Amino acid sequence: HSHGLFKKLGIPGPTPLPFLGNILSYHKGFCMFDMECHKKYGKVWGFYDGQQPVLAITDPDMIKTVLVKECYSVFTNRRPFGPVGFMKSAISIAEDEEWKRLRSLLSPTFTSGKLKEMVPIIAQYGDVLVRNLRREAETGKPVTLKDVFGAYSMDVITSTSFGVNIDSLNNPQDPFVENTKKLLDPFFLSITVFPFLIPILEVLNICVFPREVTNFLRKSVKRMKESQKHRVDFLQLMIDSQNHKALSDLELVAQSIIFIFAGYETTSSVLSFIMYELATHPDVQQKLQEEIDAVLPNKAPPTYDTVLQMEYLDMVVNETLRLFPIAMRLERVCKKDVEINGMFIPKGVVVMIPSYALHRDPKYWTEPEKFLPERFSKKNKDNIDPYIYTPFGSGPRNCIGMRFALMNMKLALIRVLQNFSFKPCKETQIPLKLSLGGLLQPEKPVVLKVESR
Amino acid sequence: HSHGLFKKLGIPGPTPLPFLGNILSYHKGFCMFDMECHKKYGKVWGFYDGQQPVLAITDPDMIKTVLVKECYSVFTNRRPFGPVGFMKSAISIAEDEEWKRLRSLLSPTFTSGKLKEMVPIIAQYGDVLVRNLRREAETGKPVTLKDVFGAYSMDVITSTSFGVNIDSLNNPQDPFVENTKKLLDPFFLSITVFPFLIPILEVLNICVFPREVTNFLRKSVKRMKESQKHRVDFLQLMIDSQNHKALSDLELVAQSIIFIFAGYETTSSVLSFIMYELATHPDVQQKLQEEIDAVLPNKAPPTYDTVLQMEYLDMVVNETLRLFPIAMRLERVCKKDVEINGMFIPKGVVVMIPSYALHRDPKYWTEPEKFLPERFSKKNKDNIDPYIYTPFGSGPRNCIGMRFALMNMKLALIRVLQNFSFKPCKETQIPLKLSLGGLLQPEKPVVLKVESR
Numbered sequence: 041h042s043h044g045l046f047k048k049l050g051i052p053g054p055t056p057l058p059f060l061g062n063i064l065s066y067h068k069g070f071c072m073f074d075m076e077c078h079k080k081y082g083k084v085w086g087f088y089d090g091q092q093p094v095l096a097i098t099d100p101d102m103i104k105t106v107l108v109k110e111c112y113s114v115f116t117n118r119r120p121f122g123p124v125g126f127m128k129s130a131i132s133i134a135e136d137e138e139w140k141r142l143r144s145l146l147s148p149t150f151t152s153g154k155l156k157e158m159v160p161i162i163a164q165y166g167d168v169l170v171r172n173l174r175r176e177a178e179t180g181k182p183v184t185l186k187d188v189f190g191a192y193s194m195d196v197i198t199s200t201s202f203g204v205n206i207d208s209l210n211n212p213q214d215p216f217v218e219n220t221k222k223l224l225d226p227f228f229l230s231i232t233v234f235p236f237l238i239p240i241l242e243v244l245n246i247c248v249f250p251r252e253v254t255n256f257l258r259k260s261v262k263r264m265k266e267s268q269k270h271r272v273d274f275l276q277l278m279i280d281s282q283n284h285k286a287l288s289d290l291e292l293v294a295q296s297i298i299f300i301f302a303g304y305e306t307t308s309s310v311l312s313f314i315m316y317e318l319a320t321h322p323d324v325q326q327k328l329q330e331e332i333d334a335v336l337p338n339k340a341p342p343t344y345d346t347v348l349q350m351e352y353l354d355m356v357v358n359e360t361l362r363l364f365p366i367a368m369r370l371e372r373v374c375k376k377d378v379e380i381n382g383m384f385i386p387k388g389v390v391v392m393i394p395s396y397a398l399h400r401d402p403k404y405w406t407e408p409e410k411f412l413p414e415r416f417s418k419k420n421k422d423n424i425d426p427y428i429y430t431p432f433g434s435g436p437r438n439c440i441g442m443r444f445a446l447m448n449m450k451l452a453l454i455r456v457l458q459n460f461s462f463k464p465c466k467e468t469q470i471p472l473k474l475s476l477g478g479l480l481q482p483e484k485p486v487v488l489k490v491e492s493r
Numbered sequence: 494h495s496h497g498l499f500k501k502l503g504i505p506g507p508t509p510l511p512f513l514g515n516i517l518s519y520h521k522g523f524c525m526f527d528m529e530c531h532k533k534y535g536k537v538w539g540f541y542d543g544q545q546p547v548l549a550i551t552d553p554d555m556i557k558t559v560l561v562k563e564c565y566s567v568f569t570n571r572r573p574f575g576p577v578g579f580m581k582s583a584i585s586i587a588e589d590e591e592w593k594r595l596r597s598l599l600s601p602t603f604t605s606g607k608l609k610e611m612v613p614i615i616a617q618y619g620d621v622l623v624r625n626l627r628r629e630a631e632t633g634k635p636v637t638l639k640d641v642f643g644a645y646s647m648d649v650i651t652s653t654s655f656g657v658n659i660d661s662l663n664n665p666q667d668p669f670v671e672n673t674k675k676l677l678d679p680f681f682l683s684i685t686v687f688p689f690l691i692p693i694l695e696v697l698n699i700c701v702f703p704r705e706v707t708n709f710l711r712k713s714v715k716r717m718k719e720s721q722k723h724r725v726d727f728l729q730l731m732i733d734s735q736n737h738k739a740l741s742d743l744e745l746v747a748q749s750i751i752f753i754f755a756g757y758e759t760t761s762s763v764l765s766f767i768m769y770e771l772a773t774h775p776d777v778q779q780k781l782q783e784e785i786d787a788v789l790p791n792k793a794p795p796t797y798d799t800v801l802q803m804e805y806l807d808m809v810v811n812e813t814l815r816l817f818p819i820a821m822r823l824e825r826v827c828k829k830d831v832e833i834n835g836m837f838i839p840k841g842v843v844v845m846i847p848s849y850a851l852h853r854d855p856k857y858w859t860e861p862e863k864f865l866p867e868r869f870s871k872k873n874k875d876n877i878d879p880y881i882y883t884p885f886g887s888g889p890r891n892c893i894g895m896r897f898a899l900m901n902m903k904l905a906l907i908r909v910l911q912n913f914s915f916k917p918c919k920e921t922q923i924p925l926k927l928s929l930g931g932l933l934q935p936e937k938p939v940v941l942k943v944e945s946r
């Protein structure tokens with residue numbers, strides 16, 4: 041019973057209940073609990089996720105030492121997570137010399153050279169979504185964004201794997217779309233109060249990934265493994281290293297699964313938050329629709345170079361990620377006893393960075409609740425501390441697919457705004473009350489109208 | 494998660510926390526939590542010991558139906574308790590047709606005829622304690638009551654087994670006194686919030702009775718089993734039925750162990766509460782010392798008949814048990830769906846009777862906090878509801894050794910008050926603040942002076 045660790049180091053925090061800790065404070069979500077703890081205890085505080093002590097830091101120098109400086113030596117892995125089954129070899133779940141091995145073997149797959157060659161591949165499903173998006177513009181019915189974007193994000197992330205060319209929104213039955221789309225609840229709440237039951241669930245072969253499909257995705261990838269014109273994509277640029285070194289056949293499959301759990305919901309959710317802001321702020325939607333027509337006249341198809349050229353588009357993507365950081369938190373496990381930026385961090389304490397709260401702190405942001413894309417203009421690019429705004433993390437273990445996610449979301453935003461306009465509807469929850477659950481989602485699916493240009 | 498069972502039946506109670514329930518309210522002990530719930534919700538209320546719902550009843554008709562009337566059909570066993578190892582065959586822990594079997598096979602061992610023949614046996618250790626009690630009367634030092642009474646209660650309960658004749662207070666080293674005297678804490682608090690971990694502890698052969706001595710007490714009883722003048726005692730009157738019917742060799746050993754865990758601390762603790770009241774109320778000690786000298790002149794040795802003759806002695810024993818009911822609670826497990834005295838009791842709910850709170854309810858008792866032995870005079874014997882004052886329980890599953898415990902405690906009180914007087918000391922906690930733990934004990938051991946007559 042080590043619930044007195046934060047009163048021992050003189051670090052303030054809410055009163056933890058026995059065994060439970062401060063998990064009852066999650067009744068308002070992580071975000072509201074992070075904002076209240078920030079406006080109460082200040083720069084550094086602590087709490088307990090059961091018996092797990094979590095130290096929160098908000099100083100830019102302290103965040104840099106944890107994320108960048110002493111990352112390899114001290115803060116290398118995130119908090120343990122189980123049960124995983126055979127999926128502990130995933131890079132986002134791997135630890136130590138297995139992770140840095142996997143990090144290097146998968147780093148060249150996210151190179152701008154490899155990314156410029158993926159432009160014609162993922163540009164073939166933007167017009168696919170436009171065809172499916174025109175279906176509901178003439179119907180006159182409001183459109184759920186997570187369903188149209190989810191199909192596009194699926195057809196993009198699958199074509200970058202090997203890949204497969206499906207029309208997910210028009211084909212909701214092939215044995216590869218529904219098989220995949222199975223991607224603070226009664227289960228995850230118990231494994232935090234009872235982390236000692238995790239080794240039990242592993243010997244029972246129970247996993248958070250239902251292994252009714254993973255073994256399919258094993259021998260469907262083993263079928264698509266080996267059994268001209270084979271070009272840039274994830275599985276190919278991972279199979280070249282298949283023939284510290286080499287990637288097991290099962291390890292490479294785990295990295296293919298983690299990329300789908302990586303790109304699918306994260307791309308579609310952020311795209312949903314972007315179209316909500318463009319609807320609730322039609323002035324931003326018009327100024328963006330004019331920079332697209334300027335860089336790309338005549339509804340020209342976008343290229344790799346023309347996307348980096350649009351600056352007001354990157355300002356819209358960055359300002360939406362500030363209001364809706366889908367990561368919410370950034371966590372690192374303290375390996376040994378260190379003293380960073382003044383204070384001493386004991387061994388085994390999870391260091392957490394409240395990304396959602398810092399993105400709405402009035403000390404760094406003017407009108408925090410407002411959606412002001414001008415916050416990221418070249419006139420204002422420098423008034424932003426890089427260690428306060430981290431929607432993709434920072435340091436050696438940041439988002440490995442940041443350049444892919446930004447290019448994939450922007451390419452969809454361009455060809456969608458080239459043909460469609462967005463004016464809010466009645467069912468539109470305004471202001472959008474965020475999901476009080478355990479992941480940054482809309483409480484009710486973002487349902488908006490869709491019109492044609 | 495069935496924490497909404499009491500709001501479902503319209504039964505009031507404190508708000509239960511998830512998984513924990515109302516166990517945090519035990520921070521003031523069971524008694525203070527029972528008194529507060531009685532003066533708040535009234536006749537019937539409920540709470541949760543983790544996921545276990547507990548319905549408390551206080552109506553005399555409702556208590557009679559649970560304890561007496563529908564006892565065999567519905568309320569037969571107490572709440573499950575583990576881990577026990579081989580000790581689940583104990584009568585206090587046995588259930589159903591195994592208990593009623595064990596209840597009948599052990600009932601004749603507590604017969605008044607068998608009890609009158611135990612008078613000369615246990616009267617040989619009263620003078621043993623007087624010899625050891627005189628040692629500290631001349632020393633001039635205060636005496637801890639639980640140590641002198643504990644040795645007497647040990648020398649009595651062991652001589653009634655087979656038995657063994659030791660001088661426990663003067664011989665604290667023989668391989669039978671210290672071997673036995675091993676008789677809301679970090680362990681029991683966890684098995685109430687985690688009752689699902691009890692089957693785990695059983696397959697590991699872990700037991701609440703440390704089996705470093707139980708197997709000794711197995712083959713030390715197996716040694717004393719079979720390997721003229723053999724007369725009335727527990728093991729002999731249980732070995733006659735050894736040669737539904739018959740008592741396994743291991744079952745009979747379990748009943749011998751449960752009797753030591755039955756008589757030892759219960760007899761010594763109540764005897765400690767009695768001498769505290771006689772000290773804090775010297776007027777009661779004088780009137781009792783005069784009835785003993787009247788029934789037993791010349792310091793005559795007590796007999797079976799002369800103990801039942803002393804009425805003011807039984808009034809002192811009964812009034813002390815009211816202020817200090819060592820059982821505190823009486824619990825029964827509901828077997829099926831029944832509707833007793835109006836309300837419907839669902840299957841699986843533990844029915845609890847707050848014995849401590851009812852013994853201090855001003856609705857039945859005048860000056861509840863006062864020690865008034867005249868409450869049990871023949872002039873006042875009838876103003877007491879028999880289902881409100883139950884220090885030995887009531888019904889088919891009440892205290893099987895009530896007649897033995899009353900006779901054993903009174904015989905000690907007689908020959909002690911015949912030779913010694915008691916005047917309180919400085920270290921004497923006045924008023925005696927009861928132990929806030931998980932069993933009715935003194936917070937600090939009752940340390941009083943001892944003088945000779």
Ligand SMILES: C[C@]12CC[C@H]3[C@@H]([C@H](C/C=C\C[C@@H]4CC5=CC(=O)CC[C@]5(C)[C@H]5CC[C@]6(C)[C@@H](O)CC[C@H]6[C@H]45)CC4=CC(=O)CC[C@@]43C)[C@@H]1CC[C@@H]2O
Nearest residue numbers: 118121132133298299301302303306366367368369370371
């Ligand atoms: C950006 C990212 C999604 C968000 C992830 C981030 C990466 C994930 C960390 C552990 C993986 C665990 C298994 C997993 C695999 C997947 O691939 C789908 C999502 C899940 C199920 C995770 C979902 C959140 C869980 C349940 C946490 O509560 C503890 C355990 C986490 C799950 C680091 C992380 C740490 C945080 O603390 C906030 C959320 C983020 C930022 C993902 C890497 C690519 C993916 O796009």
Ligand SMILES: C[C@]12CC[C@H]3[C@@H]([C@H](C/C=C\C[C@@H]4CC5=CC(=O)CC[C@]5(C)[C@H]5CC[C@]6(C)[C@@H](O)CC[C@H]6[C@H]45)CC4=CC(=O)CC[C@@]43C)[C@@H]1CC[C@@H]2O
Nearest residue numbers: 571574585586751752754755756759819820821822823824
């Ligand atoms: C009067 C009695 C002592 C008091 C007992 C009563 C009889 C015991 C019930 C279950 C036995 C469990 C194993 C046990 C064996 C022993 O023999 C020593 C004490 C222990 C360790 C018990 C101690 C209290 C425990 C830990 C409870 O918290 C749940 C589990 C109980 C233990 C019924 C009971 C029910 C109550 O709810 C209040 C207390 C009482 C009245 C005893 C029968 C003889 C003995 O003299």
Ligand code: HEM
Nearest residue numbers: 131132302303306367431432433434437438439440441445
């Ligand atoms: C809007 C889209 C995305 C956002 C906002 C995002 C953000 C993040 C963040 C905040 C982290 C954690 C950084 C840290 O802990 O310091 C992360 C890690 C990671 N991301 Fe993303 N991501 C996105 C899309 C993607 C995509 C498209 C992929 C893969 C195709 C991907 C794969 C990963 C992986 C594998 C990790 C873990 C890397 C490691 O642990 O070494 N993410 N991402």
Ligand code: HEM
Nearest residue numbers: 584585755756759820884885886887890891892893894898
């Ligand atoms: C001051 C002394 C004692 C008191 C106040 C006392 C009180 C009690 C109480 C209240 C119960 C539970 C009744 C119920 O649940 O309805 C009980 C049960 C029991 N007592 Fe005692 N007791 C005492 C001494 C003894 C002694 C000396 C023995 C044995 C030698 C003993 C053996 C038992 C057993 C075996 C049970 C359980 C019976 C069953 O479950 O069927 N007790 N007692």
